[PDB]
């Protein structure tokens, strides 16, 4: 039960890119607990987006997202040269089980 996401998403400084992962109505479309994190090589992923459309303190406002049906996406605008990272999506699969997505790489 892995949420499929594209291998990489093209981008450039000063533009906006969207990283989306696809699941099912049993996991993505059942609980509104979609979370997304940005992972840098050589370091553990950092939690950036939680509760579909919420972000913890310390997360820049440029990173956002939305949930529609069984598809969840991360919305990033105004990306900089240091924003290149691997983005993972996580959602509650039910029965207190958490399943993480495949992961998408953001290239600037």
């Amino acid at each position: 039960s892995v949420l499929t996401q594209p291998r990489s998403v093209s981008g450039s400084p000063g533009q906006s890119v969207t990283i989306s992962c696809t699941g099912t109505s049993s996991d993505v479309g059942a609980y509104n607990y979609v979370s997304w994190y940005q992972q840098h090589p050589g370091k553990a992923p950092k939690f950036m987006i939680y509760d579909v459309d919420q972000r913890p303190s310390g997360v820049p406002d440029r990173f956002s997202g939305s949930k529609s049906g069984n598809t969840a996406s991360l919305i990033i605008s105004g990306l900089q040269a240091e924003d290149e990272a691997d983005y993972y999506c996580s959602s509650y699969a039910g029965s207190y089980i958490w399943v993480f997505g495949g992961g998408t790489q953001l290239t600037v």
């Binding site: 039960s1 099912t24 049993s26 996991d27 699969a93 039910g94 029965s95 089980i97």
Partner: protein
Amino acid sequence: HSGNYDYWYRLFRSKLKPFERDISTYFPLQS
């Protein structure tokens, strides 16, 4: 884990006679 929805049942009608099948589809059939 996802949940089996292929197994339905009839919730609304008046009553079913003995050994009678109701192949007839609010929505009376709920999965």
